[PDB]
Design an enzyme around this catalytic site. Sequence first.
Site: not given
Ligand SMILES: CCCCOc1ccc(CSC(=N)N)cc1Cl
Lengths: 395, 389
Positions: B36, B232
């Site tokens: 991420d 992102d």
């Molecule tokens: C597609 C996969 C979904 C997984 O769910 C995620 C993934 C990353 C973040 C961090 S905030 C961000 N990367 N904008 C928060 C949540 Cl709930």
Amino acid sequence: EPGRRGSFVEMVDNLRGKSGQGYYVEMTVGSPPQTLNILVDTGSSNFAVGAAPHPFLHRYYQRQLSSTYRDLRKGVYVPYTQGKWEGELGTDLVSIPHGPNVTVRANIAAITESDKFFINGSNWEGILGLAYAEIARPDDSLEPFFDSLVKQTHVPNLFSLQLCGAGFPLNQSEVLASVGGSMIIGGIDHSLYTGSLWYTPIRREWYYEVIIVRVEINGQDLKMDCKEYNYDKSIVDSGTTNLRLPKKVFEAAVKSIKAASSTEKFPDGFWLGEQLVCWQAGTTPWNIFPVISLYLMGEVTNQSFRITILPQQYLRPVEDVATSQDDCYKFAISQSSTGTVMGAVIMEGFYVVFDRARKRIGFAVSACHVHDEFRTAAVEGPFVTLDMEDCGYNI
Amino acid sequence: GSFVEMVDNLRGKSGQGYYVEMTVGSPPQTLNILVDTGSSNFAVGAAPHPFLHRYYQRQLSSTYRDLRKGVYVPYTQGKWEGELGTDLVSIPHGPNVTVRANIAAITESDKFFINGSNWEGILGLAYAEIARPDDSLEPFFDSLVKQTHVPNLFSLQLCGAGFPLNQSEVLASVGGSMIIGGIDHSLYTGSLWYTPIRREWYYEVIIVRVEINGQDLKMDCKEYNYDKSIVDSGTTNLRLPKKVFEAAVKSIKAASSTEKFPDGFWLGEQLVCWQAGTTPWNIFPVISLYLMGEVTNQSFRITILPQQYLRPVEDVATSQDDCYKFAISQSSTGTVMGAVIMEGFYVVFDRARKRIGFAVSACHVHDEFRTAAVEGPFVTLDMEDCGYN
Ligand SMILES: CCCCOc1ccc(CSC(=N)N)cc1Cl
Ligand SMILES: CCCCOc1ccc(CSC(=N)N)cc1Cl
């Protein structure tokens, strides 16, 4: 204004007990009548009584001594994670001394074996499941007691419960002499509550299921999808001590309650509802703990109301392991994997009307709820709430 | 440059996230971790959860160090509660090194983990400024660079399949590559174009122009970056600020007007299907995002196809129809260049030179008539005014 009258004096103050061990009413079974104390449980639907010797029973149903006993030649096994009992089905004449002046023939499960069911010192020898046939065991063909009562008599299809917590510990002798509340069969007694009665629909007739649409801790919205509050169901259960909440909701609630009472640090064991906390006599800091409001679906479209409880309700009085003069309690809110359970803890703050006839449950501030000079429990409305049907859970 | 040991080390898909294998503790505990670029915490499930078949067991790691501090991270699309500590971490299919990094042991969560995603944690690759509880908690990549000789840069090639992948299929499919410390030339075609990282918190960039099939959306470019634009990998869709989203949908609807779709489709909520092999790609427009270049008054553009913004999903009947969901949605927190967009390109996060590079991906889905593109340069004035303050 207008003073509200109490028209069911014969049934007022007919209960005894406490949240931790259950509230019971006296009943009689058989001919001649055999007196037994019976746990009032809105969370189940079987009328079952001890019918064989047991270490925690001082008396039990003796079928061979009843001329009106009828054997159904069928067994029944009812297991619970926190208790299990086995019995033999039959029917007999049943009455409630401090209830309607009628006698009816009802089903009775004669408990012959049990594990962690009976409670030492509770003073009750059986259970009265007041919920619907759908959850009766072995199946819905075994008509529940209340159904038999209504079908055989002129008693209205409604009952109401006023569970009265003392606000302090009651020793064995004290709990036997104390009035634990009232179970009004067939009506509503106006002397048992203050303010107005607000009704929420009985979603489905199995458990006494309701729908919670909003939750607040000291006015602060827990802000969860209301569906979470009723996952996988929300019920009113006098047979359960605590207010139990779905895992995710419990986690959010405890975090908020911790934050609200942060001027005082409590051990994890306390929040787990396992260990007690004590304060010097009379110094319990009620004011640092938040009130909890549960908003319930109203009977009018897009309308809801809220019931508010105090820590005097969710902190359960318990005797110190040293029987000191300290005032001690246990946190009476815990997590659940089977939905929200509005147990005895919550019911102690209100007069609850189980209006079976109109498929609704009414709530009003109880005339015997424990409080202080600064705050009181409440039942207020109405509030405009949309898409409340989406709060209900569907498999 | 070629990093064979790291090529094809990712698995997953845009809808549930792309992940890489990592190990934590001593002895090593293997876990699949979501890559991420939109966050900065290394957090892993550390307690039983219905969606996890394994988790970090701190009491079984001899190198576990308790920081005696909790951390709560709530997002609109998911939340997790954790306990901070450190331990030895490695990436099997990455650099041959082991470093001690911070780890948030997730003990409670709400809609964070995804059923069937196959990952048990998240690797936030962004900067310390947005690390939780605060910027004192050094992010994993920062620890990696400081403790080893790994260059301060990583690149991502997210590979969308172009069709649905069932449970078993997604486990066997190669979802892409995360090259740690370098750039592998086999993952892209054409030239790499770089845009500056505006500020070092999220991987923030500045969009200066938007086109739908060559037609200028014609909005004040500041609208495109209100209140920020980020790259992102942790978000599925291409998300656009409310006003920009409304304008874009109107234009995309007009371009694809030969076929009408229910409102639910445009809301990214319901799927649309076509008989096997007949998806009318040609009626949908390409979308071009112009980015600030590194040279003064210069910009370049990246162009994606509907093969990127229409996300393959399985039909409720698992029929042979080819179905998709509209993967462009509204945002109230700025533009989010999510997985949908990244699948069309090889993205280089050049931390060392504070810039992000884009090149056509060797694994982007397209047809015989159109392809994604990265082209430049274009003369663009006052691009700094496109940034929001
Ligand atoms: C597609 C996969 C979904 C997984 O769910 C995620 C993934 C990353 C973040 C961090 S905030 C961000 N990367 N904008 C928060 C949540 Cl709930
Ligand atoms: C507080 C009294 C404890 C008595 O224990 C009870 C009471 C009721 C039931 C029926 S199931 C239900 N009401 N959820 C089962 C057991 Cl083990």
